[PDB]
Amino acid sequence: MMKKIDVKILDPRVGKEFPLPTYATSGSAGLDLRACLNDAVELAPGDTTLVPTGLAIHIADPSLAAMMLPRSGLGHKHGIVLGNLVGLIDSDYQGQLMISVWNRGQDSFTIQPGERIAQMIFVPVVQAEFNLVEDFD
Amino acid sequence: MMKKIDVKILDPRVGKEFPLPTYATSGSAGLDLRACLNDAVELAPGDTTLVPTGLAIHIADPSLAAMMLPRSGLGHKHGIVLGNLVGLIDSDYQGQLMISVWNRGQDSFTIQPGERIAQMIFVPVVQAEFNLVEDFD
Amino acid sequence: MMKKIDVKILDPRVGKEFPLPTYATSGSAGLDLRACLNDAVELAPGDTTLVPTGLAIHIADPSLAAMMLPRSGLGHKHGIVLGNLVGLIDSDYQGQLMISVWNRGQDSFTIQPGERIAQMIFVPVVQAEFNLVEDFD
Ligand SMILES: O=c1ccn([C@H]2C[C@H](O)[C@@H](COP(=O)(O)OP(=O)(O)O)O2)c(=O)[nH]1
Ligand SMILES: O=c1ccn([C@H]2C[C@H](O)[C@@H](COP(=O)(O)OP(=O)(O)O)O2)c(=O)[nH]1
Ligand SMILES: O=c1ccn([C@H]2C[C@H](O)[C@@H](COP(=O)(O)OP(=O)(O)O)O2)c(=O)[nH]1
Numbered sequence A, B, C: 001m002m003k004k005i006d007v008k009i010l011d012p013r014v015g016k017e018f019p020l021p022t023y024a025t026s027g028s029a030g031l032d033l034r035a036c037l038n039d040a041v042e043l044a045p046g047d048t049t050l051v052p053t054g055l056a057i058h059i060a061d062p063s064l065a066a067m068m069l070p071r072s073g074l075g076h077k078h079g080i081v082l083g084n085l086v087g088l089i090d091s092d093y094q095g096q097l098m099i100s101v102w103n104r105g106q107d108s109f110t111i112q113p114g115e116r117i118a119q120m121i122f123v124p125v126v127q128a129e130f131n132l133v134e135d136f137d
């Protein structure tokens, strides 16, 4: 299923030196996000750093949300994951997309400008309205 | 997309002193869950505690599930996340909704009664039936 | 919602000594995955190990993905979760399903052959096409 989503480029290297996120194959669930940094960031074991993407999206449709996830290789092999575990992006959010990068392992790790450091999926979401009851059926 | 979902209030402060979960905007993907506690809980670095919500839901439709996630600020800034990382809520689950709160950071943290300590999204889910094959197409 | 999904058995114990994953109830969101191991694996606090399932799936429909998650009991009570936090499975992936198991707690843990060590959900996904804009609406 396909959806056009408005994107605003906030840093002029995004789409040039730091490519825009894209899906590898027609069958990929997620796209890789890149670190928009001026210089490398050394991330010590146990530490968290906030990494900019240099872009904003506007999903706009309240039936859709995005979820940011670690990359599998980085998480398994290097312990490079997300400080909020999963990043939930609201349909009405229009600020810069930010990545909370957390080193959950035992070795220091260099976050390089342009590196594919996390990934993101778009999933349908349902807004609940609670119906108070005394007992369930 | 909208869905009415049956809720049973298990603690009489829920909906009064401890407001029921609600979506901030029409475009919010998730709603914030509150700690239903008699007194604050001090959570040391590395530790896990089980936090009640004082409510039960019954999703009932097997095409829907909920996922509990950390809040982004708490996770990034304070290392306050979930001990099971993501909490998966089945459509036929009718028990109290519980939150496994884990301090993944280096500073002790006070969990206060009524605090918005996690969030929850409802997503469509598909039940797979496995079809055994010798080779894929 | 239901979907037949092609599965290839890679280890002849899968479907015999190590049962194939199944949903507990008609209302379960996820199914439990089992460790396909010759012998137990002792996993020390802080450590990560790669656990085979002995099977491959081919989702095939680009409108669907799977997400691997910790089990709630294992994560909350034992600190046995996933090294990549959430495992994202692409529709065009045809390799062995692997589980990155991470001990985030303080006690060593024995991973036994056949144990239900994680769970997996199938969710619809949307592929985004970015539409560059100067300003949002
Ligand atoms: O827990 C996991 C996560 C992923 N995979 C497989 C399926 C997926 O399609 C592929 C690639 O995953 P990724 O998140 O794109 O990882 P990366 O880009 O590091 O290779 O690895 C697994 O077997 N288990
Ligand atoms: O990894 C993340 C998570 C969130 N956000 C943005 C989008 C989201 O709509 C907003 C708020 O997220 P939240 O989970 O509601 O956080 P909290 O209530 O702490 O502000 O922050 C990001 O840029 N990156
Ligand atoms: O954060 C969570 C996760 C789960 N549950 C409830 C709802 C779910 O339907 C049930 C079982 O969850 P599970 O992941 O299947 O756990 P396990 O097999 O260890 O019991 O526990 C919660 O209240 N909170």
Ligand SMILES: [Mn+2]
Residues within 6 Å of the ligand: A071
């Ligand atoms: Mn990848």
Ligand SMILES: [Mn+2]
Residues within 6 Å of the ligand: B071
């Ligand atoms: Mn919020």
Ligand SMILES: [Mn+2]
Residues within 6 Å of the ligand: C071
């Ligand atoms: Mn279970």
